[PDB]
Write a protein that binds this ligand. Sequence first.
Ligand SMILES: NC(=O)c1ccc[n+]([C@@H]2O[C@H](COP(=O)([O-])OP(=O)(O)OC[C@H]3O[C@@H](n4cnc5c(N)ncnc54)[C@H](O)[C@@H]3O)[C@@H](O)[C@H]2O)c1
Ligand SMILES: [Mg+2]
Ligand SMILES: [Mg+2]
Ligand SMILES: [Mg+2]
Ligand SMILES: [Mg+2]
Ligand code: NA
Ligand code: NA
Ligand code: NA
Ligand code: NA
Lengths: 494, 494, 495, 494
Amino acid sequence: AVPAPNQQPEVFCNQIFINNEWHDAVSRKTFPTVNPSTGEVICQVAEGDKEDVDKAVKAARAAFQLGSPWRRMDASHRGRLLNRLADLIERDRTYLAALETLDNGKPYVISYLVDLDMVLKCLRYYAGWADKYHGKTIPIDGDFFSYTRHEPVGVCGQIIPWNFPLLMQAWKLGPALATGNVVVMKVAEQTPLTALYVANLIKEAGFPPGVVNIVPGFGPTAGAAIASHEDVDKVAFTGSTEIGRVIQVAAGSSNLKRVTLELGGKSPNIIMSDADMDWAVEQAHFALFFNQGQCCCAGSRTFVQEDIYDEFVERSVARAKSRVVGNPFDSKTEQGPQVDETQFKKILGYINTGKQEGAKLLCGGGIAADRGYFIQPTVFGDVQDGMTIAKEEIFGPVMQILKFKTIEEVVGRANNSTYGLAAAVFTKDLDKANYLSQALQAGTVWVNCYDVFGAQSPFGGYKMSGSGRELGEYGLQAYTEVKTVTVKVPQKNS
Amino acid sequence: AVPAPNQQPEVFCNQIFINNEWHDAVSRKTFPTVNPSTGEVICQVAEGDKEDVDKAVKAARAAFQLGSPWRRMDASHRGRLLNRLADLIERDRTYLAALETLDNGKPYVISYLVDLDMVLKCLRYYAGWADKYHGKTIPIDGDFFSYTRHEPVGVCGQIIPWNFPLLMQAWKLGPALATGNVVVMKVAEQTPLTALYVANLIKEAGFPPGVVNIVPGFGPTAGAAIASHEDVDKVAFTGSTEIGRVIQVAAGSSNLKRVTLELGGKSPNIIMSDADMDWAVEQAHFALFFNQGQCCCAGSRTFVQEDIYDEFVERSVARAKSRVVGNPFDSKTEQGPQVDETQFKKILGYINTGKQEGAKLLCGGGIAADRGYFIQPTVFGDVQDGMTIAKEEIFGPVMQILKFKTIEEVVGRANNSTYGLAAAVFTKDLDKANYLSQALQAGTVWVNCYDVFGAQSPFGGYKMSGSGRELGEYGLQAYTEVKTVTVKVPQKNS
Amino acid sequence: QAVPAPNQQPEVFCNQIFINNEWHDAVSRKTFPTVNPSTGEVICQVAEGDKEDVDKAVKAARAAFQLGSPWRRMDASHRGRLLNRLADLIERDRTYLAALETLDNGKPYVISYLVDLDMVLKCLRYYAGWADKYHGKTIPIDGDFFSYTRHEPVGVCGQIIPWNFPLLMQAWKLGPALATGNVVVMKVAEQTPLTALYVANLIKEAGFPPGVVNIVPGFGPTAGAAIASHEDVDKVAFTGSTEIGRVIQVAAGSSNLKRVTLELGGKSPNIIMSDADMDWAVEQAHFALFFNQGQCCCAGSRTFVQEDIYDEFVERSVARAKSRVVGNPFDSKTEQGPQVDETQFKKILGYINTGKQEGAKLLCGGGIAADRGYFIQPTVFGDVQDGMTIAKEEIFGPVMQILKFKTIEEVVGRANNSTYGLAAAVFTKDLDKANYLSQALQAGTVWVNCYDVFGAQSPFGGYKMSGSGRELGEYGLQAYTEVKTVTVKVPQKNS
Amino acid sequence: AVPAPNQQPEVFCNQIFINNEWHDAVSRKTFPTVNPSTGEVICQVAEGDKEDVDKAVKAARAAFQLGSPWRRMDASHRGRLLNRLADLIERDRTYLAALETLDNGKPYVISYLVDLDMVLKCLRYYAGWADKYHGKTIPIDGDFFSYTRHEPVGVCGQIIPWNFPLLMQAWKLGPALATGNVVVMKVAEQTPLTALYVANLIKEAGFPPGVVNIVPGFGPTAGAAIASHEDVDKVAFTGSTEIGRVIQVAAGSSNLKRVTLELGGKSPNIIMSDADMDWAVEQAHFALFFNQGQCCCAGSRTFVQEDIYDEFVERSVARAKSRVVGNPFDSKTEQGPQVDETQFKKILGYINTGKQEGAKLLCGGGIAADRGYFIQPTVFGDVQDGMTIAKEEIFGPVMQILKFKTIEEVVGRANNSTYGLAAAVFTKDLDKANYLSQALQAGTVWVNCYDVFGAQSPFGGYKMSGSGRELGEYGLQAYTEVKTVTVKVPQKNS
Ligand SMILES: NC(=O)c1ccc[n+]([C@@H]2O[C@H](COP(=O)([O-])OP(=O)(O)OC[C@H]3O[C@@H](n4cnc5c(N)ncnc54)[C@H](O)[C@@H]3O)[C@@H](O)[C@H]2O)c1
Ligand SMILES: [Mg+2]
Ligand SMILES: [Mg+2]
Ligand SMILES: [Mg+2]
Ligand SMILES: [Mg+2]
Ligand code: NA
Ligand code: NA
Ligand code: NA
Ligand code: NA
């Protein structure tokens, strides 16, 4: 039971957040953020650039100074603050969910039940890690006492995308704050609003000034300034593989700041002939169409064994044809519009390429509404590995169904990609499941399920889908700088 | 008790090692490797370039294929192989120590008692880790069974320096092989001999073909080919900060391969007025002059509290003057020549800058011999923070002694650097020791000691001294790719 | 810092047996009185649980632990949510619980409020974070197999606690147990059952499924022994005397081989080196001994002082002991309340006479401090020798022992020459002396330049006969986990 | 292929091992050890009692004193010593395998290929743990620095059984010595020889005097003296559930020494209808009959689904009838004699009980030879849960086959036992495998296999099958005493 939404939530925050205060861009410039459902401007937002990032980094560095309130704060207390932040977010859950839908386009029911829930679970999970990421006492040779201190990496630049505005912010802040780091976050220009409101909650929660600084703005400007900053110790980025390369280059070209990347993919969803048909069809649908197809780990390569190909395709088409597209604020809406005009056009371009290359168009393929950025649920059959839609990340409601014969064959085809974010296996057989999960070159391998995320379980990509992991205990690794202290002792004993 | 060395050890390996076989460079080109003590050529060595690296990567990739001998091998057996390799290196200890000295220049007594001992301890330590780096079973929400597999990152490109040829090879091979990875190693052009002989021992130990491949050659050629290779999954580099930046940029500009760096420093060695004078003086001497001053973590900024400054300096100068420079094969030799002419000239250049800038030359200052790359143990007193010799890594037998008054002052001065590899504190006071070890922004802080390395304790730098850590359990992190497997289960129970 | 005014006569709302989130009278309908140690008067009667009541509690716990039950299926993260909720409810009723603790126990209200309750909240909140983080392992075993371990709950946990820290001991037990999905049958101390029973009401209010936590107030040889000997209790955690510790382990072995962890007493040495900060060491040595009316398991009951500073250290310690305010625990000026009961009161008086009889120099106190209640004067014995009974046995009262020593090698030997090894401390400014001593001392916790510094993050437990196993920190989860290895045959094992 | 065995290996050690020396019992008494294949006395062995244990404990205590050679020894060197012992054991493998067979009765081929191999793997695995079991640095509240030291528990009393003499000794010594503890081992009166010979190797390997002391003798005498000793810090026992209780009572009655127990069981081996018939039959045979049925985790309750019951039974009887029983030194022998006359008669008694209670005798059931303790491979069909042979541990070549219908039924019947050491599931279905592995109350659950031991994976029982775990990292826990050191610092920072 979801509370009735305010289909027109008021915007209270639209500036640059530094030292728990709101500031206009030094240039005084602003940029519009659009409601993808109507194509209308919601409001103006401060356009942060290099100079604003500089102010943000200085504030973060000051908050990270030895002896500061944030540095002296008990680890357990950082946990207390993260829990308080989660409580505040829960209080304002109905509002944030509506605002998320307004600025992003995803169905309100999904914003409320899925996104906001995961945000709360991520923040509360990491709050528990605050005073538990122990260093080590080491039995080194000789008369010495050796141990390690798990110190904060320092000033962390965090650049996030627009597909899960609130969630991406939580996946970043959770681990960083739990370990005592300070943040300079650059939210996506397409979805800056919700993250900015949470900044107000961060101040209300009690976090010292400068611990979390948010700079809304464009990528080549604000984003690059963070990645190239001489005083940013670490950068965490989630987005396109293309910009991931730019980030890494900027890091190497500047102060050698530590880097972790969460990029895209072309994840293979493998359906074996012994899989539960009804379950696999529904899960394959969800795997691809979830969040308007705007998911990094989307099951965009649906491999189906020949014996069950026809039936699976028929059922998948029927499911795609009945998928409700419309106003994200209407409870019956399963799919809202795409984030912006650029994505809208790019997706339509991919559908055209799909038709041109010989992929069999089974349903959809065009615009779903005359207003907004709505696209019809599209399904392509008889897709070949060499096809563009079978290789490139579409990031829209466009499903690819491929046919295979043997298990050995599908492993090779699934792995024949520059991406490796995720994969899935649908089978009732124990050996097939273990054979495939071990063989698949992907960060996450789901068996008889898809898009199952847990704050306890790490997520990240193999190959060019990224480096490093987020969520779980692993999510703390990149936010820790290790110091070894080796002390001479009179006489070491076991 | 050190066995009498063969002052002219025969060279058996001087080619490119691929698939457990010796090959000439595709171009058939060779480069000379010089004996720094005499300036004479030892022998010619195959000059590996891009085409040779390509062959090496393909061999490594083949050896890493699923179902291959190396992939199927029990983790405990990889441990058995590492132990076997250690035994073979111990069998040929006297020979390797002599060859190390011949090619590098360091005293034979040191090569035998220190370098070789550390190589053996490193390999035997990692041998034990082979079957103990567990993944995790995670209590994720919902009806799921979630766990992680700690798989090998893959084809690892390993680029190492010339200061500790065998030890650097060990620090790289140990963690990589322990975790089931395959290697393409680029040894330093100044010291390729000892590493090539070890390749023979790797074959003798029983490691499958392609598991370890070694390509001797230059940096911009062979090294850059590895860093930019589209099929290399991870690169580990040890060397200058300048080239470290080049490596990270190459990785980002290519296939987003994972990166870890071990660069230089300008490590501060702080002597508080309550320190044991005799011990502090001897340790500070060792901290700087060890291995001809060619140590990444050399104590190149000796901070001495004003009350004991004069006495400390007087004793330091006396010790530097008594240091025996000469033939590394002579038991009485404490300091051999610098690695090559380039380093020789660079050091003399820094000494000149020290004189030009007003630092007080207290002893040494020039060449120590008319043949070979020998430099006199040099000590500069009254060094100021703004001086070139106080900021840049000299990598030679040139000591800088600075004066300070308060503990608060020295912390700021010690940390005022783009480097942060190591640091040391000499004091008898508990509080001062804890205050300093916590406040110093350095990868390793030594208290009442220096250059105390243990295979069990991690080593790495803060800031621009590098990223990631080697040695200890931490050394396994960069050689692991994490995979999450999440399986739907009938009903999850605790 | 600031403390809300206490209700010096807090109303008692819970005084029965807690099973399946409901209150029950003992099957026998028997009740026992709990006394206010400050006045010696009866506060109220409490249901007297016995074997038959324990059996019911164990059966309820077993049912709550059945596969498919709400508590077994509950997401680990949610168990953490429930623990945080319980902590919030305890904080809401902090002032009430602080006063009730003082009424039943006797400790100063200011301490119950600022110390005990604070530590309770911190313990529960720490463990809530552990709920979904105590991972099992995936193991690189030889051959074509996939091997891993599940960290399952040990099962029905019997927890028997003492009276010196009623609420805190309850929290130290519940936190790790609930965080790991176990169920509990807790036997609170007969001298202080009230606060734990009220917390049961908060456990129900928090949302814990019925049977997850069951509390049986009653005596030791009856209710406590029934838990230790129970054929369906999988694990027992006990805190109290070394003697009952042995009885518990024997009962475990003679019954179903239930797993056992013990937190017993000690005769903890507090070593003061000649280079220590005098003022700091004196104040800390006083605290180390006299805290909680000297009723602390890890009390620094053997104060070793280096000869060169002995005279001055003693003079300052005596003056500090003489200035210690003894009186009504509800009065803000009060530093020391009464001992927990008449039995302890008499036992301490006996040890004081024992000290005088064996030759220890009585420096101050040594008698009854008040006509009513169980108040004892802060007592200090000087020139104590290792062979004295007051130097060997746990007094558990406001009785300090000061011993003199010369060298660091000597003090290590004397401090370790004991059947106890719960804790120890070292006061020195020297790096080497601190490292030499912390390594050499055979104790569970070694404090350097401090004492009684507990952290929910750091393990606590004894060496030798001071106990086995550890509580608090990550280590506190070990005893509440039963490890299962699952080894599956796979087509072809690859790294 | 296995080397030719010396069918009558010379006995070199038969006394009490204390301080790396051989002693007779204080009472000068000895006891005979018998060859179970002929019933003939091999030799006399010193009968250790309380006074001998007292001498061993004092020696162990002395070796454990602070500052002793064993206490000061580098953790890494303890690993070196364990690896050396393994090497000596491997050098004398042919001899030890033959001696094991002579004293125990198990087939020489198995002693050589299985027992000795596992002994080597156990010691080599733990050798690797010596310097890797780290303590922690903890982020405690307030201005303190808190850390934990993982110290050795101290003097460890280790009492082991006769079913796997050498292996049981290795499972105890490996973890204990890896963590720096000292040992007073009490070997089984039925099989003291091999352990005593290894004591010689322990001395030859270089372990300091008193680190390992071995006292051969009886249970109520030497064993009980160890369990009740006032100066033994920890006791690890493997044997019967009955004596396990006696050990725990002794510990509680004495000095509260820490306790871990590895007892027996009545492990259920579950065969679902979709299991691989051939594989399940051979594995079920192995599961029960392995080691003359003298295995703690023997699959003595073979549950078979009704649909495949008749066929499974027919194949199981045929396999049991073909099992070769005879001279353990003959390469064709699969089953040697039982350990002694006591066990021999106990098993026959159980077989008679099985017949009286209504179980269907399908094959065997009697003595297999007129000399030695040989018993025919016996199989009972239509066994019911209430039958004595279905509840009590037989420890002989007596198989129980029960029929079941549903999965919920088999899980409940399998769990309806006071034991819970191990269990197994044979099925091709993923969900069935996961459901059973989770629901079964057993220390180890094998899936599509049985008796798969790995030094890397823990082993131990649920309920009355024991407490604590051996093998893996978990095996180190009981050998560690944890010490927390909390230090006041001037100002704590993250
Ligand atoms: N951190 C260290 O341990 C360390 C080691 C050696 C040198 N140094 C520093 O570096 C200074 C210069 O010495 P150097 O030139 O021999 O160090 P370097 O960084 O140039 O060489 C290190 C390794 O990287 C390879 N390399 C060089 N250029 C490369 C490139 N363009 N792409 C890929 N790999 C490349 C080299 O061949 C060698 O194998 C030294 O004086 C000292 O200050 C530091
Ligand atoms: Mg872009
Ligand atoms: Mg260079
Ligand atoms: Mg009592
Ligand atoms: Mg017996
Ligand atoms: Na928008
Ligand atoms: Na050279
Ligand atoms: Na009371
Ligand atoms: Na025998």
